[PDB]
Amino acid sequence: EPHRFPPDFQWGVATSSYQIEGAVEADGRSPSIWDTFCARPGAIADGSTGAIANDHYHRYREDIAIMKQLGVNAYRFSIAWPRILPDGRGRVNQAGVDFYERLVDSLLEQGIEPYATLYHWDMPQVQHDRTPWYDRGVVDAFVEYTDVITRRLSDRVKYWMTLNEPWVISFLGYGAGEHAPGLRDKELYLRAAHHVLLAHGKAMPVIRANGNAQTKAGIVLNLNWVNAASDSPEDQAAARRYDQFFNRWFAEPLYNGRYPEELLEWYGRDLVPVQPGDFDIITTPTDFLAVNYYARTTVKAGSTDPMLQVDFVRPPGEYTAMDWEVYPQGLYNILNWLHTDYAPPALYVTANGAAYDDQVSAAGEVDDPQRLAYLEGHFEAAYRAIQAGIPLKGYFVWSLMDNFEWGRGFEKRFGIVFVDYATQQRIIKRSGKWFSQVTRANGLP
Ligand SMILES: O=[N+]([O-])c1ccc(O[C@@H]2O[C@H](CO)[C@@H](O)[C@H](O)[C@H]2O)cc1
Ligand SMILES: O=[N+]([O-])c1ccc(O[C@@H]2O[C@H](CO)[C@@H](O)[C@H](O)[C@H]2O)cc1
């Protein structure tokens, strides 16, 4: 009774432009908000930057050959706005566009389907200098970028994601000051959450317009399974407030043309710069919803978080090196909520994986039994999802290989493939050799 997935199921791995590329000055690429952010003392746990990362710019062919070994039929990557429009708007940089053409051409000729994320956090600094995410002019700036690169590649690229993890882009970048540009203000975060949604909305008909009937496009939300520490009244209020903050702040606008009522009031409705016609734009029909899932979050009333007044409770169980609770059930539940609340015609897991302190054995091998366990569990939760009649068409592991993990630097390795930063050597981990059996059996033995 082998648990096998639908025939045309998309098995993938996922990267982002700044996390893998390096060659940060190469071929007229301009500094991104992250290139400048990495300079800030205490911003990156290990004091590193994305200047070299995985050197995937000069080494993409090797990586595609490793992907062919992994046996995937799809690859999720982000395009770097800094390479395509270095000045933010205006002159297209052909050298920049040249790279993504060589990358997509290399992918298609190995029969790997490209999934192009338009924006994975790496705005050109010169552009941010004019239109931060909290300034409404960003919407036009993003759409122009989208138009350029979707004109160049939509012949060869059918699947487009608009923006990766609005909640991250807005709260981590402007809310908690933990990501580029690293500002920390309730209003700034909300304006940014709203202009990200608006930007996703206006970019949709520009993607379809540059494509054909075969063109498919959607947003990427990160969603956590939220849980109340107790069935008490003001704890269920903390969980509900935190669920609305993370999950429902982006979902509700996208499908029901509205922010959650309780949290919108809690904040002050005036802080959110909603102009007339915005909800028409944000609700623009999409082909799929893409989902990043990592962990469960159990919540009580408290003051750890000044803004939401919540504390986090850690239930007894399995934790990754990231201090993220391992809870595959969470993935089945998130998919099922989305299925029943919003009825998206397709779902994708565009990112799921786990960081563990890897070690190269004397044999030059990487034995990561804990990552292997993590992925099996979530693959299982994804299989149980399909058997309930949830239209999950694909699954991309985060990540193909160890990379720049943002504020945690190179210390947190997510790859099913090890990278020795000393030599740039790729070693397929045990979890990778196993993933190679899964993709080719199109299921779990
Ligand atoms: O899917 N996402 O975007 C996501 C990923 C990892 C997350 O991390 C969780 O967050 C909580 C608050 O920090 C922790 O208390 C909890 O133990 C951890 O599992 C939470 C959410
Ligand atoms: O605050 N959180 O819960 C959170 C933070 C960053 C997140 O990041 C996601 O997952 C990976 C790291 O977790 C990234 O490497 C990747 O760029 C992104 O899609 C996802 C969630």
UniProtKB/TrEMBL annotation:
PROSITE patterns noted in UniProt: GLYCOSYL_HYDROL_F1_1, GLYCOSYL_HYDROL_F1_2
Keywords: Carbohydrate metabolism, Cellulose degradation, Glycosidase, Hydrolase, Polysaccharide degradation
GO MF entries: beta-glucosidase activity
UniProt enzyme class: hydrolase
InterPro entries: GH, GH_1_N_CS, Glyco_hydro_1, Glyco_hydro_1_AS, Glyco_hydro_1_beta-glucosidase
Protein's GO biological process: cellulose catabolic process
Its EC number(s): 3.2.1.21
Pfam families documented for this protein: Glyco_hydro_1
RNA-binding listed as a keyword: no
Catalytic reaction list: Hydrolysis of terminal, non-reducing beta-D-glucosyl residues with release of beta-D-glucose
Membership in a protein family: Belongs to the glycosyl hydrolase 1 family.
NCBIfam families named in the record: BGL
Protein name as it appears in the record: beta-glucosidase
Organism: uncultured microorganism
